Each structure stands twice: as structure tokens, then as C-alpha cells.
Motif scaffolding. Structure first.
Motif, PDB file in Angstrom:
ATOM      1  N   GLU A  53       0.828  -1.194   0.000  1.00 49.26           N
ATOM      2  CA  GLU A  53       0.000   0.000   0.000  1.00 49.26           C
ATOM      3  C   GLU A  53       0.871   1.256   0.000  1.00 49.26           C
ATOM      4  O   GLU A  53       0.519   2.254  -0.622  1.00 49.26           O
ATOM      5  N   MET A  54       2.011   1.206   0.691  1.00 54.88           N
ATOM      6  CA  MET A  54       2.911   2.361   0.732  1.00 54.88           C
ATOM      7  C   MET A  54       3.470   2.623  -0.653  1.00 54.88           C
ATOM      8  O   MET A  54       3.419   3.745  -1.143  1.00 54.88           O
ATOM      9  N   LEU A 109       0.804   4.220  -2.763  1.00 57.46           N
ATOM     10  CA  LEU A 109       0.554   5.588  -2.346  1.00 57.46           C
ATOM     11  C   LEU A 109       1.710   6.525  -2.700  1.00 57.46           C
ATOM     12  O   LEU A 109       1.479   7.608  -3.228  1.00 57.46           O
ATOM     13  N   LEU A 110       2.951   6.123  -2.419  1.00 56.19           N
ATOM     14  CA  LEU A 110       4.096   6.996  -2.742  1.00 56.19           C
ATOM     15  C   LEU A 110       4.122   7.281  -4.244  1.00 56.19           C
ATOM     16  O   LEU A 110       4.488   8.371  -4.678  1.00 56.19           O
ATOM     17  N   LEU A 159       1.340   9.725  -5.206  1.00 58.83           N
ATOM     18  CA  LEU A 159       1.607  11.060  -4.685  1.00 58.83           C
ATOM     19  C   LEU A 159       2.774  11.726  -5.373  1.00 58.83           C
ATOM     20  O   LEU A 159       3.070  12.894  -5.125  1.00 58.83           O
ATOM     21  N   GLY A 160       3.439  10.972  -6.238  1.00 62.14           N
ATOM     22  CA  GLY A 160       4.571  11.500  -6.967  1.00 62.14           C
ATOM     23  C   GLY A 160       5.887  11.498  -6.213  1.00 62.14           C
ATOM     24  O   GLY A 160       6.861  12.075  -6.697  1.00 62.14           O
ATOM     25  N   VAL A 161       5.921  10.863  -5.038  1.00 66.51           N
ATOM     26  CA  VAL A 161       7.139  10.787  -4.233  1.00 66.51           C
ATOM     27  C   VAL A 161       8.172   9.900  -4.928  1.00 66.51           C
ATOM     28  O   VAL A 161       9.373  10.179  -4.893  1.00 66.51           O
ATOM     29  N   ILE A 162       7.700   8.823  -5.551  1.00 71.34           N
ATOM     30  CA  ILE A 162       8.566   7.927  -6.308  1.00 71.34           C
ATOM     31  C   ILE A 162       7.927   7.800  -7.693  1.00 71.34           C
ATOM     32  O   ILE A 162       6.737   8.082  -7.849  1.00 71.34           O
ATOM     33  N   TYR A 188      14.772   4.030   2.388  1.00 67.13           N
ATOM     34  CA  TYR A 188      13.742   3.076   2.027  1.00 67.13           C
ATOM     35  C   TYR A 188      13.958   1.713   2.657  1.00 67.13           C
ATOM     36  O   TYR A 188      12.999   1.016   2.962  1.00 67.13           O
ATOM     37  N   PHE A 207       2.187   3.895  10.054  1.00 69.56           N
ATOM     38  CA  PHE A 207       2.254   3.818   8.597  1.00 69.56           C
ATOM     39  C   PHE A 207       2.362   5.234   8.037  1.00 69.56           C
ATOM     40  O   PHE A 207       3.234   5.540   7.221  1.00 69.56           O
ATOM     41  N   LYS A 226      12.154  13.288   0.427  1.00 66.81           N
ATOM     42  CA  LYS A 226      12.084  13.441  -1.024  1.00 66.81           C
ATOM     43  C   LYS A 226      11.867  14.887  -1.487  1.00 66.81           C
ATOM     44  O   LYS A 226      12.501  15.318  -2.446  1.00 66.81           O
ATOM     45  N   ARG A 251      14.502  17.150  -3.735  1.00 69.74           N
ATOM     46  CA  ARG A 251      14.184  17.818  -5.007  1.00 69.74           C
ATOM     47  C   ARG A 251      14.631  19.270  -5.014  1.00 69.74           C
ATOM     48  O   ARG A 251      15.145  19.758  -6.015  1.00 69.74           O
TER      49      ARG A 251
END
Ligand code: EMC
Ligand code: EMC
Ligand code: EMC
Ligand code: EMC
Ligand SMILES: [Ca+2]
Lengths: 114, 114, 114, 114
Positions: free
Chosen positions: A8-9, A12-13, A16-19, A33, D50, D61, D65
Motif C-alpha cells: 500500500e505504501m 501511495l508513494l 503522490l509523486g514521491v517515487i 527506504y 504507517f 524526497k 528535489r
């Protein structure tokens, strides 16, 4: 311990555009990570707190490295501008010299002052 | 309270490349690492939460110092480029002056316009 | 809720060099420190978790502001170097022009080619 | 789960100057704030932990950036200064050449050495 939350992480990441892609979350050898995954697959508060501690120190260290990369670039720019100024100084001085040598060479053509 | 986890953390941080050697984790006088060690050797949630709070503030402060070092370098580069421009301005102006003095000195050799 | 730990934190942060004086820890209007104090004076996990969340967001925001200050300085340096280059270009071109005007003025003194 | 604390956080972050307006806290698509909201609306320690994990990774992150943006600006400045130096080198060399061509052209006016 549990790949559900890890799954789920990652999703979600990504959303959200984190990865850029989920496979990137899991798998990655990035200290931050690694600890995050270990934190999600924790089932006891001793492992969890251990892994969160590791996550914070990993985050601090990775950010410090990036800031240090910028510091190195700044040092290169500083010395480069300094070198440039001094090349300009040497040249300008040479030029002012050539100018007076030129004006003097031109004085040997005067009809007066001799 | 317990050097077991402190030991495992040092090993893991080393293997992950966060630190270069384990002795460096433990021992180090770095605020972030001091609080991290204290956090690992905590056995009650009051010490633990206390130590995590300290870890986050220490992390923030160390990062702020590094960013401030870069800021100082940027200020030095900015003033250096500014000083350079103005030395160039002064010189160029002098040169344009020398040029006209030269062209005029050369007018005293004309056969016409006199 | 409890100034004991707040007191111990201020002392420890000072001894570790994170802050220059303890009064600075407590008192300070810094978002990070405000949340940290609130976190220490928490007696329930709902306030504590609330305050830790606030501490992390405050830390992120303050670091972002400092990095943005550096970004502005970089933009000023970039435009400054660009302006400088173009002043140099204009000048060099003018100079090359003056040179040929000078060499031509000197051709009116030749005994041959006329 | 509960908008009470989310509401109090938005107000506090605004009053502390962390954000410019409360609506900005809630709503915002910022990964850090998304996780923070989710953390506040958590009612179990599995969701909470979580969401805190996600908050820390999002913070890391976003900061990375911004530091990378500065790195790009530094690379542009570095190459710009390098290009400038080499334009100056080429020009200076040309100028020194013009100087000697000029002094030689002036030697054809000497009464001696011929
Ligand atoms: C409970 C985070 Hg070391
Ligand atoms: C529970 C971290 Hg101050
Ligand atoms: C439990 C930190 Hg919001
Ligand atoms: C308990 C923070 Hg992942
Ligand atoms: Ca920077």
C-alpha cells in the motif's frame, strides 16, 4: 513480516509523486527506504522504534550528502571566478603597458618637443 | 540500557553505507547520533519519545548549518562577481578613453583638416 | 504539563552544541521548537503524536525556506554572470571595430598602395 | 477519522507561520501534508505508524528535489563561467596579436633600422 502495508505504501508513494514507480520503493537499496520497509514489516514496538530511528538518521545523512555536493560545486565556482579575475588583472595591466608604449612610439613622430 | 540494538544499528548503518565504520556510529559526539544511541538504550516510552524529539531537532539543526555554509559561499561568489564587473567597467571606460586619445594623436598626422 | 523534561532537553541541546543557550530552546517562537516543547509537555499519546507530526512538518518547512534562500542567491548570480558576459561581448566587438579603424587610419601613411 | 485535530493543526501551523493559510494545510496535494492529514485522522497505531513513515519519506524526497534544483543552477553557473573565461582567453590572445601587428606597422615609419 507483512507485505500488505509495504504494498500500500509503494502504491501511495507512487500516486503522490514521491517515487516514479512502486517497484522502486520496495527493492531499492536506499538506506531510507530500507529502513522504511523494515519499519512496515515490524510487528513489535522494539523493531518499529529501531527502524524509525534508522529512517531518521538515513534521511539526515542522504540530505547532508546532497548539500555537500552543492558545497563542492560552490567551491569550484568560487575558485574559477577568482582565477578569472586574476587573469583579467594580469591582462589589463599588460594592456595599459602596451598603451603607453604605443603613445611613446607615437611621440617619435612629433614635430615639436625636439 | 541495552547495547545489543546499538550494536545492530552500527552494523546496519555501515552495511547500508550511511556511515563508513561502526565505531563511528557509537562514540561520535554528533547530536543526531547521541540522541539515536540514547533512543536505542531507552527502556521506557518517556525516554524514547524524549530522545526521538531530540533526534529530530538535532537533524534539523545540522542540516540548517550545512545549508547556511552554502549560503555563505553564495554570498562570497555574488560579491566577487560584482567586484569583477565593476573592475571590468572601470577598465573598459579607461580603454575607450585611450582609444580616442590615440585617434586624436593620429589626427596630428593628417595632411588635410589643417 | 511537565517542565522537567523541557528543562533537561534545553540543557542537553546546549551541551551538544545544537543551541547556544538553553533559554533559547524554551521561549523561542521557532515552529520546530514550539512543537518540541508541546511534545515534551504532553501526557497522552494523542497530544504527543499530534505534536510530533507538527514537529516534522515544521522541520521540513524551515529547511525548505533556507534552501529557497540559496536558490534565490543562485538566480541572482546566474543573471549577473549573464549580464557580465553580454557587456563583455558588446565591448569586445567595439574593440575589434576600433582596431580596424585604427589600422585603416594607419594605411593613410603608407608610401605604397597609392 | 477525526477532523478536530486536523483543524487545530491547520490553525496552529498558520499562527506559527509554517503555512500562510489553513485551507492550505488540509486540501493540499503535497505528499508531506497528505500523510500528515492521514496521520491525524488515524485511530489505530498501525495506521498512525504507517502514516508517520510516509511523512518522513515524503519530507526527505521534497527536500532532496529542492536541493537538486539548486544543484542544477550551480551546474549552469559553472559552465557559464567556464564559457566566459574561454571567450576572454580567445579575445585576449587576439588582442595581443593586434598589438604586435600595430607596433610592427608603426616600425615602417622609423627613420632608423633601414
Ligand atoms: C520511535 C522512533 Hg526511534
Ligand atoms: C515520539 C517522538 Hg518525540
Ligand atoms: C507519531 C508522530 Hg505524528
Ligand atoms: C512510527 C513512525 Hg513509522
Ligand atoms: Ca543548497
Amino acid at each position: 513480516e507483512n507485505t500488505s502495508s509495504m504494498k500500500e505504501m509503494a502504491t501511495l508513494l507512487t500516486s503522490l509523486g514521491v517515487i516514479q514507480s512502486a517497484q522502486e520503493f520496495e527493492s531499492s537499496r536506499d538506506a531510507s527506504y530500507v529502513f522504511a520497509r523494515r519499519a512496515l514489516k515490524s510487528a513489535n514496538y522494539a523493531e518499529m522504534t529501531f527502524n524509525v530511528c534508522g529512517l531518521i538518521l538515513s534521511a539526515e545523512k542522504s540530505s547532508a550528502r546532497k548539500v555537500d555536493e552543492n558545497k563542492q560545486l560552490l567551491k569550484q565556482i568560487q575558485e574559477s571566478v577568482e582565477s578569472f579575475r586574476d587573469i583579467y588583472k594580469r591582462f589589463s595591466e599588460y594592456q595599459k603597458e602596451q598603451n603607453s608604449l604605443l603613445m611613446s612610439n607615437l611621440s617619435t613622430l612629433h614635430i615639436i618637443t625636439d
